[PDB]
Amino acid sequence: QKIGILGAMREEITPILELFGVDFEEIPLGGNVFHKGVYHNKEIIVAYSKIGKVHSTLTTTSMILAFGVQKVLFSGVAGSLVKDLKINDLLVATQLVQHDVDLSAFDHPLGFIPESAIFIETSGSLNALAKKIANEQHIALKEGVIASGDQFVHSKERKEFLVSEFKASAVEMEGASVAFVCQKFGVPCCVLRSISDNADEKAGMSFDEFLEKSAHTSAKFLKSMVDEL
Amino acid sequence: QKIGILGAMREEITPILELFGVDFEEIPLGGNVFHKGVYHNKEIIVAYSKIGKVHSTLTTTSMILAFGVQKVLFSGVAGSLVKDLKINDLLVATQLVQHDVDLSAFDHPLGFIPESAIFIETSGSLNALAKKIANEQHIALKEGVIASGDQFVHSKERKEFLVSEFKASAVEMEGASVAFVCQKFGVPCCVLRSISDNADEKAGMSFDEFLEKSAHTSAKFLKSMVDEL
Ligand SMILES: Nc1ncnc2c([C@@H]3O[C@H](CO)[C@@H](O)[C@H]3O)n[nH]c12
Ligand SMILES: Nc1ncnc2c([C@@H]3O[C@H](CO)[C@@H](O)[C@H]3O)n[nH]c12
Resolution (A): 1.8
Which residues are bridge partners to B189 per DSSP?
B72
Rounded to 5 degrees, what are φ and ψ at B58?
-60, -50
B151 touches chain A (CB under 8 A): yes
Q: Which residue of A has its CA nearest to B107?
A: A204
Q: Which residues of chain B lie closer than 8 angstroms to A184, CB-CB?
A: 30-31, 58
Secondary structure class of A39 (helix, strand, coil)? strand
Q: Which of B25, B43, B172, B197 is catalytic?
A: B197
User: Secondary structure of chain B in the HEC alphabet?
Assistant: CEEEEEECCHHHHHHHHHHHCCCCEEEEECCEEEEEEEECCEEEEEEECCCCHHHHHHHHHHHHHHHCCCEEEEEEEEEECCCCCCCCCEEEEEEEEECCCECHHHCCCCCCCCCCCCEEECCHHHHHHHHHHHHHCCCCCEEEEEEECCECCCCHHHHHHHHHHHCEEEEECCHHHHHHHHHHHCCCEEEEEEEEECCCCCHHHHHHHHHHHHHHHHHHHHHHHHHHC
Q: Which of A77, A90, A191 to mutate to test the pocket of ligand 1 (most atoms within 8 A of CB)?
A: A77
CB-nearest to A54 from B98, B103, B151 is: B98
Domain with residue B143: its CATH number is: 3.40.50.1580
Is B197 a catalytic site residue? Answer: yes
Method used to solve the structure: X-ray
Cβ–ligand 2 contact at B174 (below 6 Å): yes
* In contact, B196 and B77? CB cutoff 8 Å: yes
Say how many C-beta atoms besides its own lie within 10 A of residue A157's C-beta. Answer: 7
Angle between helices B203-228 and B124-136 (to 10 degrees): 90
The total number of structural domains in chain A stands at 1
* In contact, A60 and A49? CB cutoff 8 Å: yes
- Annotated binding-site residue? A7: no
Rounded to 5 degrees, what are φ and ψ at B119?
-105, 140
**Signed CA dihedral, B113, B114, B115, B119: sign only:** positive
- For residue B135, what are the domain limits? 1-229
Q: Which of B29, B61, B99, B156 is the mutation pick for testing A, counting most A CBs within 10 A?
A: B61
